Amino acid sequence: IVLTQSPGILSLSPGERATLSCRASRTISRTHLAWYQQKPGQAPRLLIYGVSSRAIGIPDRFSGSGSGADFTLTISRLEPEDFAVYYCHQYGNSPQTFGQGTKLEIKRTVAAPSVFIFPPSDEQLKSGTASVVCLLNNFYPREAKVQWKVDNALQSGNSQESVTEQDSKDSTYSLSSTLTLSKADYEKHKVYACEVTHQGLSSPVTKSFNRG
């Protein structure tokens, strides 16, 4: 019983109403669906049990409706504590399946990243490897693209990215990308550049440095 939730990422403001759909590929028996919420770093909290029936401590803003193969979770008025991931879960006469989840992020003004670059430390160079870090700080929306260039040679497959959860204050995101070279390769070249693309940027932003 595959469960498909929609939309993938829901971007709303505190005070609006949120509608989240859960569509199954079968029948889901009868009154055997649950809605859980999950915040980063916590266990899932049961919001609604048995399609309609609510759970203890769950406010009246949360409401479960639907039946058959289409179900919906509705939040009447969004509060800041309501922005998280939401899962639907059937547990009736099946191998108990889950949905992939929907992300409720706070919608805000498009904000461009602050791009910084950090060369490897001399300690790490003495260790034998070299890491160059690129930081995109406090941007929105979450979608952004980085590209490494060593002496104007595009780097592919030798870097890794990481993104923060949405900041509880300014509702922005941050990303860090690490490019990993050997000490020899690092000392063979000079110009190390991080090229950044984001909607809030009128121009792609390049933060670069030279060895020395």
Partner: protein, 214 residues
């Protein structure tokens, strides 16, 4: 009261892990890979004494049960690296209405050939290439540790605003790497001391790293 689970576990590929869940109704065992959704492993109700599994894990999962339920996963692979939860859904009665969910704290299980190792804390030093206007950025690269997790603070917790500790990445070597950055006023780079405090409890590695420009 609550559900308590056993501590975190590191296992090699092909071995087995047994996770306990002691109680203070059915007991459900689910798991979640890092950055992934919820996956139902199985359930065990003590009334019958028989557990039900998922067809994916049917061959290698055993759930059984002092008030303690056990979940054993055999022939462990890297895909099974996840946080494992036990849960009880109990029905409460008040105002003639019937609901309540109880969860364990979760058990991190890491399947890897890697051996436990403390990290190296290198400085991401501030410079003219890491300052926009009057705000500079500086941080700490916590590289080549295993396993998860690692905690980072700044100035023994005195520096909290403008702090961003990113999720770790799993490098091709099977070792984790993380970065923790902070933005401060650029005029403070020479007058204010900035130190990142890194704790990797699995290897019992603690490092305090002063981050200075140049």
């Amino acid at each position: 009261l609550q559900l308590v689970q056993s501590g975190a576990e590191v296992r090699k590929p092909g071995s087995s892990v047994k996770v306990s869940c002691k109680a203070s109704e059915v007991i459900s065992w689910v798991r979640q890979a890092p950055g992934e959704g919820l996956e139902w492993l199985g359930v065990f109700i003590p009334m019958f004494g028989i557990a039900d599994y998922a067809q994916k894990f049917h061959g290698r999962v055993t759930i059984s049960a002092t008030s303690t339920t056990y979940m054993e996963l055999s022939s462990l692979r890297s895909e099974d690296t996840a946080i494992y939860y036990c849960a009880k859904v109990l029905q409460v009665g008040r105002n003639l209405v019937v609901p309540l969910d109880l969860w364990g704290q979760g058990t991190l299980v890491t399947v890897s050939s890697a051996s436990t190792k403390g990290p190296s804390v290198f400085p991401l030093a501030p410079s003219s290439k890491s300052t926009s206007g009057g705000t500079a950025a500086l941080g700490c690269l916590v590289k080549d540790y295993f396993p998860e997790p690692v905690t980072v603070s700044w100035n023994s917790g005195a520096l909290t605003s403008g702090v961003h500790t990113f999720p770790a990445v799993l490098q091709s070597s099977g070792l984790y790497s993380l970065s923790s950055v902070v933005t401060v006023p650029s005029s403070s780079l020479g007058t204010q001391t900035y130190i990142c405090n890194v704790n990797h409890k699995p290897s019992n590695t603690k490092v305090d790293k002063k981050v200075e420009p140049k």
